[PDB]
Amino acid sequence: GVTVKDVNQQEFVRALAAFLKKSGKLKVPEWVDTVKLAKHKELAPYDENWFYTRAASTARHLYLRGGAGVGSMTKIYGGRQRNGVMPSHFSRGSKSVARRVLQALEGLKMVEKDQDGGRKLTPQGQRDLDRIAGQVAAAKK
Amino acid sequence: GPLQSVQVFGRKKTATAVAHCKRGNGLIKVNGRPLEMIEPRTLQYKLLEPVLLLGKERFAGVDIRVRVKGGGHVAQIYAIRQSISKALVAYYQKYVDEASKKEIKDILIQYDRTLLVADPRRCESKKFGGPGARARYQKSYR
Amino acid sequence: TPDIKLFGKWSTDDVQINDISLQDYIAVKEKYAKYLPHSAGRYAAKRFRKAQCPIVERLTNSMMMHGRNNGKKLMTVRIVKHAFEIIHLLTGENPLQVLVNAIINSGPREDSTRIRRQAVDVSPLRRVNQAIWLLCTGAREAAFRNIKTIAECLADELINAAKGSSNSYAIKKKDELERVAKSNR
Amino acid sequence: HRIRITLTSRNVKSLEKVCADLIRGAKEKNLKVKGPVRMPTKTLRITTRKTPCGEGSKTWDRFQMRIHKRLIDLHSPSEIVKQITSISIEPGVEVEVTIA
Amino acid sequence: VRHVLLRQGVLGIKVKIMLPWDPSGKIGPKKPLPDHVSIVEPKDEILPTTPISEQKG
Amino acid sequence: GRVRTKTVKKAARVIIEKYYTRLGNDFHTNKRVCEEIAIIPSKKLRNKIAGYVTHLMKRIQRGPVR
Amino acid sequence: QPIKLARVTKVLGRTGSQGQCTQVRVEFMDDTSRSIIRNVKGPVREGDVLTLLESEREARRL
RNA sequence: GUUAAUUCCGAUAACGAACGAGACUCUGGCAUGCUAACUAGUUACGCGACCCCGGUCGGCGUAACUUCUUAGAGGGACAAGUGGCGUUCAGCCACCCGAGAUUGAGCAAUAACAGGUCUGUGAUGCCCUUAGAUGUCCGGGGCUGCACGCGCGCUACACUGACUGGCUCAGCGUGUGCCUACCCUACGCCGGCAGGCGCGGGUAACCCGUUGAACCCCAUUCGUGAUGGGGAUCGGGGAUUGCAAUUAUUCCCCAUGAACGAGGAAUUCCCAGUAAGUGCGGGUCAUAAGCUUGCGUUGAUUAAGUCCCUGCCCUUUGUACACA
Ligand SMILES: [Mg+2]
Ligand SMILES: [Mg+2]
Ligand SMILES: [Mg+2]
Ligand SMILES: [Mg+2]
Ligand SMILES: [Mg+2]
Ligand SMILES: [Mg+2]
Ligand SMILES: [Mg+2]
Ligand SMILES: [Mg+2]
Ligand SMILES: [Mg+2]
Ligand SMILES: [Mg+2]
After folding, report:
1. Site of the Glycyl lysine isopeptide (Lys-Gly) (interchain with G-Cter in ubiquitin) crosslink (chain E)?
2. Hey, what long-range contacts does D35-42 have (CB within 8 A, 24 or more apart)?
3. Which residue of E37, E41, E42 is in closest CB contact with F11?
4. Where are the domains of chain C?
C-alpha cells in the first residue's frame, strides 16, 4: 500500500486528531482547558481540542523517529521567545504537556518506553497510522 | 542481475544531497518521500524541471533515492534539483550511449547552468569591527 | 510540455514587445522565461548580465524591500503569482503582456541631471530599472496602511500602468520627471 | 590482540612522518594493521584585543592553535607495540597506547 | 626583546637577526626563500653531427 | 592587474637563455621542464615563470628579442 | 517635435560632474545618413536603441 | 605607455643594490582519481514491524567500497588558446574550454606623534606615604543617584503584519579545572511555568546530538480602530544562584497598557552569497547578552564610472609658513 510519507502531513495530523475524536479514551488531564502550552507562547490556543492534534503530531513524530523523550519534545515544540524590549531567542516548550501526551499514549497502546531512554512506536500504532494514511490517500484520490 | 547503482552528490552553499539511481520503475523520492510533498510548495515546478524538460520516457526506467543533509530549505531543494539531474547524466553516461547523454546535457545547459554546475559562492567570513562581512559599525564623530 | 515552457499555467509565447528599444532588455521570450521567477543567482556579476535576467525575476527581487521584507523570495513569488491571477481575472489578457506594456509605458524616456540641471535621454536598461522601481514603489505605497492586499495593489498598479490612465503612482512620477526634463532643457 | 595507538600532534608533517613510520614498522614486522584514521582537527580560537590598555581603534587578534589526532589499530601482542613505540619518537607527537 | 635597568632609566633592546639558508638546516632554515629562484648551470654538451652506435653486451 | 614581476621575468630570461633547446610552445610541457631544471619553491611562482617563458617563446617565434 | 529612434554605434566617454553620463554617438534608424552625439545616463553598450523625444538637440563635445 | 602597486616596457650620469608591494601562510571551491577508517558511513543481503511482487524504517547485524564523513600527499589557473587594441614591447577587453579568467583575512617599509597605557606586570627612574598608613584585612554604601544634551545599539510604528496550531531544514563551536570551592546534559516522575527529585553518558567524531534554531511554508482568528501593532511604567505572587538581592541579580504567572501613524537640519555603512532580515556558539558568567567575536538560514536594489565634496599619492609652479 502506502506510508505516511506519501501522505500530505498537514491534513494527516487533522485526520489523526479526528481519529482520536472518534476513539475518545485518551484520559485527558483536568488542566487542559485553561493552560498555556509554553513559556514563550502568549495566549491559549484558538482550537478547543489542541491536545488531540498535538497527540497526533506526537504520534507521527515518533513514527518518523523513535526514542524521543521529553527534552526532544520540548525541542520540537520550541519557538520564538518574544522578550518585548529585548531581542528574541529560542525557547523550549512545556515539559508536562508532552509528558501527559506520552502518558496518554502509554495508557492506550500507541507508544512504548524503550531501552536507553525514550519512547518508541508500537506495531499497533504503526498499523493504525498506516490505516489512516490509506484513509487520507483514499480521501485525496 | 547486475546492479546498476549510481551514487552522485550535489552541493549547494552547505546542503549536500546524494542521489542514487538503479534499474527500476519511474518513481523518484527524496528521504523516503516523493517530490509532491517537499515544503515549501512554491518550488514544486522547480523540482519537476528535469522531468518536464526530459519527459517521462527518460525517467521511466530510472528510480532515484536521495539522502540529504545540511543547509536550509531552498538549499536542499536546489541540492536535490542539481543532484537528480547529475545522477541521470552519470547513469546515461555509464550504462547507455554517450550521444543521448550529450543531448540531455545540452538540454540541461540550454535551460540553466545550476542543474549541472554547482555554484561556488559560499558565506564570506565576518570581520572584526563590523556586524557583517563588509559592513562596519556606525562611526561616531564628535 | 517539453518543447514550449509554461510559466505556471502561462504561455511563454504570444508576448508582443511593442517598443523595439526595449526588445533586448526585456528578457521574456523563448529563452529566459522559466517555470518560476525564483533562481539561483550570479546575475550581478557582470555589468550587462542584469539584462539577461528575466523581468519577472527582476520584479520578484525588487519587491522585497524596507527592512522587514528583505530576504523573503518565496513570499514575494507568492505575491507575484497571485498578482498575475488578479491581473488575469480583471483584464482577461496575458499578465506577462500586461507587465511588458506597463514597463514600456511607465519607463521614462528622459531625465535631468547635474552637468542648474540639464536634460538627457536615458539608457533603455536604466529605463527598465526605473520602471521596475517606480511601479513597486507605487504598489507598496498603495498597500501600506490599507485593507487592500499587496497582490491586489500590485495588480492594480500594473493594470493602471498598462492602461496609462494617469491613476498609477509610477505613471504620475514618470510624467513628473518627463515634465521636469522638458522644462529644464 | 587489538591495541589502539592514538597520535596527537600540533605539527602536521611530523605527525604524518610518525604515523608513516608506524605503518612501515608494522609492515616490516608483518602484522595486520589498519590505515591511519584521521579525526576532525580542532582549532583552539582565542580573540583578544591588540591594545594592552583600552584606548585605540577596535582591532582584534585571532590566535589559532590547530591540534590533530590520528589513530592506528594493531592486531599484535603488547611487546611488539612497546618495541615499535619505543623507537623513533619526536617531541611534537604524543602517543597514547590503549591495550583494550 | 629584552630590558636593561640603568641608573637613570630602563632601556629596551630589540635584536633581529636573519638566518642564512642552508641545505642541512643546522645553521638556518631548510626551506629556501620564496623569491630566490635557484637556477642551475647547464652542462656542456657536444651535439653529434654524425650518427654512430655504442653497441655493447 | 596580471603583471609579472622582475623575479619572474629575469629568472625566465635566465631559463630561456640556458635551456633554449629544451623549452617549447606548449605550456604544460615547458612548465614541467622549468620545474625539472629550476629550483622553484612554490607552484604559483612556477606557473608565473612558465607563463612568461611561453610568452617569450612566442616573442622569439615572432621575431628577435632584445 | 516628433519622436525618433536612434541606435548606439560608439560610446565616446564618461561625462557629467560626478561621472554619470555616457557620451554616445547615435546613428538614426529612420535616416541612416544623419548621426549625432548626445550625453546619455545609464549603462550603455554598443548596439541598442534609445527613444529620443527630439533629435534637434546636441551635446557639446569636450 | 602600462599596473591595484617605484608593476613592468623603454629612455638615461648613471651603475650595482636593499626594505615595502608582489612573492608567502591560512581559508573557499574542483578532483566519481591516490591514501584512509566499528569515535562517519554507503549500498547489498539476513531478519523484525506495518500497508495493499512492491514501499518506508537514524529498528537490529554483517559484505565490499569511499559518492556523501574527515584529513594527508599531489594536481589544477598561467592572460595559457582564439578575436581585436597597443612602439606590435610592457600590457588591456571580450570569447571557447573550463569549479574558479579580481574569494577573503594575517603579515606588512623609512621617519614620527611629546597619541593611549605607571589602573597588566615582582618592566621601571624620580617624587609622596610608611603604623593614627596611599600597605593589607573586615562591615555597609557607591561605581546604578537625575531639571538636562550627546554617542553606540535593541524594540517597534503593523495587513508584505500579529496570534494560534501543523510541517521543516544548519554550521562554527563549547563541555567536569594546580590554587579553583564553579561542566554539557540524555531519560523517568512532581508542577502551568520558572524549576525540583533519581539513576545514567561524556576528558569528546563515543554523550548531550541526525545539534528536530529561527526567518520562511501551510491552515484558522484579526479588519485600518493607537487595533489582537508596540510593551515602557507599576502592583501582587512563585522558583534558581550566592554568606548577603533592599536601589526590584535573573527567570515564570496574572494584571496595569504610555509615547510611537515611516521621523526636520545633519550623518553612518555597503556593492555578491554582499547589505539587510533571522537565529545559534565563545568571551565577560556562581547567578548573565539589548555588547563583542565567530557561524549558519533566506537573500536582493543599483554600479563596472568620477574628482563635484571629503581626502590621499607623483610632476611643475609661488611662498613673507617651518610649534609648517
Ligand atoms: Mg519550532
Ligand atoms: Mg495591505
Ligand atoms: Mg606619548
Ligand atoms: Mg600626552
Ligand atoms: Mg569592602
Ligand atoms: Mg560604569
Ligand atoms: Mg493594545
Ligand atoms: Mg502584541
Ligand atoms: Mg562589555
Ligand atoms: Mg607670487
Report:
1. 31, 43
2. D36/D7, D36/D70, D36/D71, D36/D72, D37/D70, D37/D71, D37/D72, D37/D73, D38/D68, D38/D69, D38/D70, D39/D68, D39/D69, D39/D70, D39/D71, D41/D66, D41/D67, D41/D68, D41/D69, D42/D66, D42/D67, D42/D69
3. E37
4. 1-185
